[PDB]
Each structure stands twice: as C-alpha cells, then as structure tokens.
Symmetry: C8
Subunit: 199 residues, 8 copies
C-alpha cells in the first residue's frame, strides 16, 4: 500500500502539472492510472484489514475529481466520481462491519464533496448519484449511531440530510430535493427515537 | 428461525444481484421467496414467543421494498409494502400484549419507512395505507405510554403525527393530510392528559 | 360486569371480522349487541358503584364507532356516537359526584375522539353534538378543578377548548368555531380565577 | 334558605326535563318559579347575612339561563339574564361592603357567563347589558384590590377587560368593543398605580 | 366636612334614583347640589389642611359624571367634568406643596377617568380638556418623582402619557394624539434623567 | 437674586392671571419684565458664582414660554424661547467650566422642552433653533461624560439624539431629522469610545 | 506650543465673533491664521514628541470647520477639512509608531466628525475624502488592536465601518456605501481573527 | 532577507510618492521591483525555513495592490494580485507542512483583501481568482483545524465562506456566489464533523 500510495500521489502530481500546462493525453492517462492505483489500494485495504487506506484512496479520488472540474474534462470526471462514490460505499460497509463512527462521517463528507464538485461542473446525472449515495450514507449513519452510541452521529445525519436538500435547492433537481425533504422528516423521527434509546 | 433467517438473507442477496444485473424472473422469484420466508419467520416468532424475530422480519421486508423502488417493479413492491405493514401491525399487537416500548417505536419507524418508499416511487394508494397504519401506530403508542410509563413515547407519537402530516404535505394527498392534522390536535390533548397522569 | 365485558368484547371481534369480510347483517347485529351490552354494563356500574366499568364501556363504544368509520355504515355510527356521548355525560356526572379527576379527563378524551371520528367520516350533525358535549365537559372540568385542587385540570380544560376550536376550523362549522372561541376566552378568565384561588 | 334552595333545584330539574321532552308551559312555569325562588333566596341572604347564598342563587340563575339557550326560549332567557346580572350587582355590593375578594371574582365570572350565553343565542341587547355589568365589575374589582390587598385581583380585572373586548370582537358590537378597549387602557394605568401602592 | 360629605352622598343617591326613574328637574338639582357641596368640601379641605377630603370630593364628582353619561344629560356632564378637572388641579397643587406621591397618582387617575367618560359619551371638547389636564398631571408627577424619590412615579407618568395617546387614538383627536406622542418622547428623556439622578 | 426671583415669580403670576382673564398689554408687559428679570438673575449668577440660579432662571423662562403657547401670543413666545435657549447655552458653558453633570442634563431638558413647546404651537423656525441647541447640548454632554466619568451621561446623550429625531419625525422638518439621524450615528460611535475609555 | 495654542484659540474667538457679526475678510483671515497655527503646532508636536498637541490641533481644526458650516463659507471649509483629515492621518501615524490606542480612536472620531460636517453642509467631494480617511483609520485601528491588545478597538473599528455605511446611506453616495459595506464584511472576518488571537 | 525587505520597503515608498505626484514610469518600475523583491524574499523564506518572511512579503504585495487601486493602474494591479494570491498559496502550503494555524488565517485574510481590492477597482476577473483562492484557503483551513486542534479555525473557515458569498452578492458574480453558497453548506457539515471529532 505504501509504494502504491506514493505512485498514486506522483501520478496525481503529473495530472496537476498536465492540467496547468494544458495536456490531455498525459492528463487522462495519469488520471486513470491514479484511479486504478486507488482501486488497487482499496483492494489491499480489505485484504489486509486497514480502514485508513480506504479513506486515503477516497482522498486521492477526490483530488482527481477536483482537478477534472478545474480542467473540465467530463469524460474522466464521471469515472472519478463513480470511483469516489464506490469507495464511499465500501467505507460505509467496512465501518458498519467494525463499528467505527469516524469512517462513516468521512464517507458522508466524501459523498457531499462529490456532490459539490458536480454542482460546480454542472452535471445533473452524477449529482443525482451523489445525492442518493449521501442519503444512503445518512441511513447507515443513523444505524451506526443506534449501534455504537455516539449521539453526535445523529446530528451529523440530520445535517447531511439538510445539506443534500439545500444543494438540490440551489441546483434545481426537484426530484432529489423531494427525496431529501422526505428523508429529513423521517430522519427527525428516527433521531428522536435513537436519542431516547441511548441517552 | 435461524436457518430461515439465513435463507431469507441469501434470497435478498440474490434479489439485489438480479436488480443490479437487471433480472425479472429471478428478481420476483427471490423477492416473493423472501416475503414468504419472512412471514414464516413471523409465524415462528409467535409460536416461540420471540419479539426480535418480528423486527428482523420487518427489516428484511423493508430491504425488499427498498429494492423494488430502486428497481421500480411495482407489482412486487405493493406486496412487499402490504407485508411490511402487516408485520408492523403484528409488532404493535405483541408489544401491547407484553408491554415493551421499543417494539412500538420500531413499528412506527417501519410504517413511516414504507410511507417514504411510497413517496419515492409515487404510489398514492400504498401511501394512504402506510399513513393510516402510521396513525394507528401513534394511537397504540400513546396507549402504551399511558400503560408502561416511558414519557418519551408521547413525544415520539406527536412527532410521528407531525411527520405523517408533512409527508402528506409534500406528496399532496390532502385527505391524508387532514386526517393527520386532526390526529395531531387530538393527540396533543391526549398527550397533556398522559403527561399529567404519569409525571 | 365481567361476563358482560367478555361478551361485549367477543361481539366486537365478530363485528371486526364482519367488517373485514364485508358483512352487513352480522355487522349491525354484533354492533348493536355490543352497544346494548355496554349500556347494560353502564347500568351495572352505577348499581354497584364502579367507575372503571363506565370507562371500559366508553372504550368499547369508541371501538365500535371507529369500526363504523372504517366501514362507513353511518346508520350504526350515529347510534354508536350517541351512546358514547351519553356514556361521557354519565362519566362526568359520577366524577363530579365522587370527586375523581381522571374520570373527567377520560370523558373529555372520549368526547374529542367522537368528534375526531365524525371529522373523519364527515358527519356535521354528530360533529356538532360532539363539540357541544366537549365544551360541557370543559365546563365540568374547570368546576372539578376548582373543587378538588389538581391544577393540571385547568390546563387540560383550556387545551380541550383550543382543540375543539381547531377541529371546527378544519371541518368548517363556523357556528361551533364561534362557540369554541368564546368559550376559550371565558375559560381563560375562569382559569386565572381558579389558579389564584388554589395556588 | 335550605328548603328554598332544594325547591329551586327541583324546579330546575323540572325545567330540564321539560326542555328535553319539549314543553313550554311547564318550561316557563318552572323557570319563573326558579327565578322567583332565587330572588327570595337573595333576600334571605341579606336578611341573614350570608354571602354564599347569593353565589348559589347566581349559579341557579345561570343554570336556568343556559337551559334557555339550549331551548332557545328568548322570552324567559332575557328575564333570567336580567336576574343574573342583578344578582351579580348585589354580589359586588355585599363584597365591597364586607371586603371579600372571592365574591367579586365570582361576580365577574357570572357577568362574563351571561355574556357568553348571549353570544351563543345571539341577543345583542342582553350582550350589551352583560358587557356593561362586566366592566362595572372590573371597576369594583380594582377598587377592592386597592382596598384589601390581594394583587391577583388586578390581573383578574385586566383579564376581564381583555375578555370583554375579545367577546365584543367576535360578536361585532363595535360600541361595546370601543368601551372595552378604552377601559383596558385606563385599567392598565390604574393597575400600575395599585401595584405600586400595595407591593 | 363630615356632615357635608353625608349630604353630598345623599344627594348623589337622589340623583341615581332620579336617573333610574327618569327625572330631569330633581336630576339636575341634586347633581348641581352635589357639585356645590363638593366644592364647599374642597374649600373646607384647604381651610383645615386635609388632603383626603380633596380626594373624596373628586370621587363624588366622578360619580356624578358617570351618572350623567349613563343618563346622557350633557348640560350637567360638562359642569361635572369641569369641576372634576379643577379638583384634580387642586390635588396636584396641594400634593406638590406637601410632597405626597399618592395624591398625584390619584389626580392622574381622576383626569384619565374624566377622559374615559368623555370618550364614552363622545364629547370631543371635554375630551381635549381632560387630555390637557392629564398631560399637565404627568408633568407634575415627574417633577414630584424628582423631588421625593419614589421611582414608580416615573413609570406611572410614562404610562399615563401612553394612555392619553392611545385614548386619543381610539377617539380620533389627532391634535391631542400629537401632543401626547411628543410628550411621551420628552418624558422618556426626562425619565432617564430622573432615574439616573435618584437611583 | 432672592428679591429678583420673587419679583420675577410675581410677574409670572400677573402674566398667568392676565392670560386667564384675556389681557394683552399686561400680558406682554409682565412677560417681558419676567424675561428681563431672568436675564438679570443670570447675570447675578455668574457675577456671584451660583449655578442653581441659572437653572431657576431657565425654569422661569420655560414657564413664560408655556404660557405663551396656551395663550398663543407668538411675538412674545419667540423672545421667550430665544431667552431659554440662551440660558441653556450659558448653563452648558458654566457646567463644562466647573464639571457638574446635573447642569448639563438640565440644559438638555430645557432645550427639548423649548422644542416641545414649539411643536405644540407649530413654529418651525424656533423648532429648528431648539433642535440645533439640543444637538449642541448632546455634544457637550458626551464631552463632559468623557471628562468627569458618570457613564449615564452617555445614555442620556444618545437618548436626546433619538428624541430630537423623533420630534422632527412628528413635525416634519426633514432637514432637522437628517441632522439628528447622522448625529445619532456618530454619537453611537463616540459612545462606544467613551464607554471603553472610562469603564 | 503653549503660546501657539493660545494665539490659535484667540483667532478662533475672532472667527466666531466675525461669524456672528457677519464678516468675511476677518472671517477668512482668522480662519486661515488658525489653520496655519494649528499646522505649526502639529510640526512642534513631532519635533518635540508630544501626541496630545496633535489632538488639540485636530480639535482646533474641527472647531474651525464647524464654524464654516454654520457660516457656510465653503472656500475655507474645504481647506479646514483637508487640514483636519491630514492631522488625523498624522495622528494615526504617530499612534501606530508609539502604540497608543486612544490616539487612534480620536483619529477615527475626527474623521467621522469631518464626515458629519460635510453631510451637514452637503459637500459630496469632501464627504468622500472623509469616508476614505475613516475607512483607512479603521484599517489602522484593527492593526493596532492586533498589536497592543485592547480588544475594544475591534468593536470600535467595526462600529466605525457601520457608521460610515449609514452616513453614506443617508447622504446617498452609493460608491462610498459599497466601499463601506465590503469593508465591514472583511473587517468582521479580521475581527474574528484578532479576537481569537488575543483573547 | 533583511536588506531585501528594506529595499522593497524603500521601493514601496518610491511608488507611493510617485502615485501622489502622478508618475507612471517610476510608478510601474518601483512597483515591479517591489514585486520581484517580494518574490525573491519568498524564495529566501523557503530556502532558510522562515514563515514570517512569507507573511511580510504578502503584506508588501498587498500594499502595492492597494496603491494600484488608489492609482487605478490596472496593468500593474493584476500582476500584484496574481503575486499576492501565489504568496497566499505558498503560505497555505508551508502552514499545512508545519502545522501552524496563524499562517492559514493570514492566508485567508490576504485572499479576502485581494478580493476586496478587486471589488473596489471593479475587476471581475481577478475577483473570481481571489474568491477561488479564498475558498481553497477555507478548505485547507478546515483541514488544518482537523489536524492540529484549534477549534476557532472552524468558525473562521465558515465565516470566510460567508464573507466570500456576501462579497459576490454585492459585486454580482452569481457564479462565484453559487460556488460560495454550496461551499458554505458543505463546510457546515464538515464543521459539525470536526467539532465532534476534536471537542
């Protein structure tokens, strides 16, 4: 994972330099190499039981995504966002498996950041994918909160729902906005339930 | 119940894989097998006096329902929601029988989640069924609260009424909305009564 | 009263099964048998000085009423609501006779529940009867509060007035709404008087 | 007074039964007999120095008035309200004579209840008479408060003024409403004066 | 003063009886006799240094004024209000002479009550006279407050200004309203000054 | 100063009697004699170092001004207001010379009272003169506050600015209103500065 | 500096007398002599290291400016305001050199007072110069606050920004208003930074 | 760095004098010399590991930028702002490298000040560059806050986001405004996460 991480970082540097200079071939090549290396690192994380590696792969994926938006190359941006959301899902899975809150919060932040990058570039499709992943992460976040105490997870989940709603508000995807509003309502109910259970 | 639970879980995995790959025959087959197994597990729960089994069958039913909405296959979604509401009713029954609050709260959450899935898919019929079941659960929730103390049940019941109202607001079923508003009023009254009684 | 109560309960079960299956003859027959048995039980309560029997007869009557609304058979629903309001009046009478607050609160809740069932079915006539009975119960509630202390009865009475007003608001019976608003005003005055007297 | 009270109560029972059955001759006869007996009891109260008798005569008069409104027989209702207001005036007189607060508060409540009965039946004339009597009672209430301490009388007086205003608001007698608003202003001033004096 | 007071009281009783029966000659005769006797009593108060006599003469004058409004005889009502305001001025004078707060507050209340009686009868002329006298009393009230401590006089003065403003608001005399608003502003300033001085 | 004060007071009594009777020659004569005597008394105050004499001369001038407004004789009212404002300026001067807060507050009140008298009579010219003098007094008030502590002077100055603004609001002199608003802003700044300095 | 200060004061007295009498030649002559003497005194202050002399020269300049506005002679008013702003700049310089807060606050007040005088006379040009100098003083005020503690400087700076904004609001120079609003925003940020740093 | 700093300061003095006198050749020459010297000083800072040198170079760059806006020479202003933003980026880099909060806050303030200078001059291009750099600094600020404690960094980051939004509001660059609003939402989420993590 260490050599993998360093190679992925150097490829990200290549991609940033190619974006500043204005390359495409090296741009997409280093980008997809970084995503392949990040997926390989995610594989290594589960084969060797390391959660932090998943988070770092997510961060690497996020960096690649941000670069695409500055660059604007959508063809690679979509692949990067798909990778980032998949890594977020894997993070949720391993966190619910182990019972570690911080991983869930990082998953929620990764989902929301993919959403924000979409909102910046203006890609309604990946925006919907991101919002769906974020609401799913809110689900799993409330569930973990119920499982392992940590009341602040409840507040974080409600706030993530509100954030998804407001982001859909600015962008305009009323479908996503309706999903988010209904989810905030039902999550307020579940929140009162879990708070009473634990506290 | 254990082997039953594992078989139902594996059938749910089959259904999820069939939904991602895009199957229908295996999709509906594994789905209805999961519902049949969940109903069998509900039977086993009462024949062997286990409440938690009812909750797990509800969760399994809920998972199947969510999948239908992602999939969109309404013909199975309606059966799944009917099963989920019936399991919620059984949960209310056994909870009022024993005097266990947590079961009632889980029933309310199951009803509201069926409602939210309906709101997502946009099926006004099952939405009305879900809202009615939820208000009934609020009734039984206030009743138990009066029976076994636990004041937080009162707040949960009022909040469930408010949630049903707001969900009907977003969807638009003004009939359900009127039922919910009137129910919130009369429940505020009953709430002041029960709070004075217990506290 | 015990055998009477069990027979009334079994008749209620008959009525529920007939409503689910879709009967009318057995429906109305078991319903009117339940009401006759509940009135007989009310008789037994006074002849043997038992208040709780009155409350249980009220509950049985309420159950029959709810069933009519799900069923929609108005011809029996009106008789059931008339019975329920009469039982509420008897409850008020015996409570003011003995000086027991809880009975008065249960009377208020029974009146409001008859009102809510009317609002559900949409029968303005019985709605007016229910609202009148509820305001009368608020009168007697303030009176008892003055008699036997228990300040919370004051808050309950004001809240019942507000609830009658809001229910008339949703339904639309402006006459009942005006009665309720005027009654809330004069009850706020009486409330300040009684609070100063006792506290 | 005791035999007088019992005879008046039995006549009230006659009147209630005649109202339920639908009589007029016995209705008005028992009603006017009850009012005559209540006035006789008021006479007995002053000739034998008993304040509580005045309050009970007021209550009896109030009961007769309520019955008229349910019945709707205005020709007797006006006489009943005139009697009730006169008894309220006598109560104010004897209370200011002795220096007993509770009697004044009961007078205010009697006046407001006559007003509310008028508002129910819709008789603007007696409504104006009632509002005038109520404002007069507020005057005497502030005066007693200044005389015998008891600060809560001040709050009760201001609240009675506000109640008269709101009742005139619902009914519509803008003249009475203007009287009440001006009276509330000047009573707020007098209230600050009396509070500073006593406290 | 004692025999004078009793004769004035008996003349007031004559006037009340004449108003109920509907007299004019005896009405005006007893009224002007009462006012003459009250002025004689005011004379006696200063010749024998008794402040309370002034207050009682004011009360007697106020009673006569109220009666005129119920009666509506304006020709005597104007004389009564002129007398009452003059007695209020004399009360202010003697209070500032001696340094007794309660007398000033009673003067303010007398002025406001004359104003309220005018507002009832609807005589804009005497209304303006009353408002002017009330603002003058507020002036002298702040002055005394500065002289003899007693901070509550400050709050009473500001409240009297606000009351004059609101009364002019309901009646409509915009000139008086403007005077009152400007006076409230300058009195808030003087109030902050006096509060800082004393406290 | 004593004989001067008594002669000025007697001349003021002459003027009041002449105003009630309706004189002009004696009215203006006693008025201008009172103003001449008050100016002579102001001279005596500085020649013999007595501040209170200045305040009493101001009060005498204020009394003359009030009388003009009741009378309405503008030709003398303008001279009286000019005298009063000049006395206020002299009061500010001697107060800043000695360092005595109360004198400054009395100056502010005198200026505002001249303003209020103008607002009553409706003389926009002297109103502007009064507002200018009042804002100047607010300046000197903040300055003294900075000099001799006494934080309440700060609040008094801000309140005087607000009062000048509101008075200009009612009257309508938008120029004066703009001056006052700007002055309130800059005085809030100076107030935060002085509060931090002292406290 | 002492003889210089006295000569400048006497020239200011000459200018005030010439303004009251209505002179121009002596008016402008004494004015420009006062400004020349104040600049000479500013020179003396730095050559002999005395900050208070700068403040007194500023005050003298401010007095001359005020006089111009009462007089209205713009040709000298502009020179006076230019001098006052330059003295304010010098005050800021020497204060930041030494590290003395009070001098900075006095600079801000001088700038705002020049602004207020401009707003009075209505000279948009010098108004813009004053607002710019005031915002510059706010900059240096935050900087000193960061340098020498004294948190109240932060609040004073924010308040000066708000005051500049409101003054531009009343006058109408939307450009200055936009500068001030943006400056208030960025100063709120810098304020949170400095508060966290020090406190 | 010391001689470099002094030479850069003297060149800044040359530029200020040339701006007041109205030069262009010396203006741009001293300006670009100052920027070259500041970049050389930034080089020296990293080659000799001194963070404060970076901040001083930023301050020097900021001073040059301000001067351009007063001067209005855009051709040099753009280069100055580019330099300032690059220095801000370098400051963020070295701060995240070492783990020193104050440097990050200074970077945010530098970015916002470049933005404010742009808003003053009205150059939408550099305004967008500045807003982007500021949001990037907010990102790195939250990241450091998570890294090295110091909760106040969280509040500073949220406030910087709000400030960028409001600045875009006044100027009008709705694109930048949308970026800022979305960033504030996602930063509120990240803020709740980091606060829960640390505190």
């Amino acid at each position: 994972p260490e050599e993998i991480l360093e190679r992925a970082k150097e490829s990200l540097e290549r991609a940033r330099e190619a974006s500043e200079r204005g390359d495409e071939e090296e741009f997409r090549k280093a980008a997809e190499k970084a995503l392949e290396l990040a997926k390989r690192l995610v594989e290594q994380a589960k084969k060797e039981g390391d959660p932090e590696l998943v988070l770092e792969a997510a961060r690497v994926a996020l960096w690649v995504a941000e670069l695409a938006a500055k660059n604007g190359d959508k063809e690679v941006f979509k692949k990067a966002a798909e990778s980032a959301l998949e890594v977020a899902k894997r993070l949720v899975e391993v966190a619910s498996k182990e019972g570690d809150p911080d991983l869930v919060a990082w998953a929620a932040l990764v989902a929301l950041w993919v959403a924000f990058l979409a909102f910046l570039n203006g890609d309604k499709e990946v925006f919907k994918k991101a919002a769906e992943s974020a609401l799913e992460v809110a689900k799993a976040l409330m569930e973990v909160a119920m499982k392992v105490g940590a009341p602040w997870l409840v507040e974080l989940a409600i706030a993530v729902a509100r954030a998804v709603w407001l982001l859909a508000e600015l962008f305009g995807d009323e479908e996503v906005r309706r999903r988010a509003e209904a989810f905030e309502i039902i999550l307020r109910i579940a929140a009162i339930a879990v708070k009473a259970w634990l506290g």
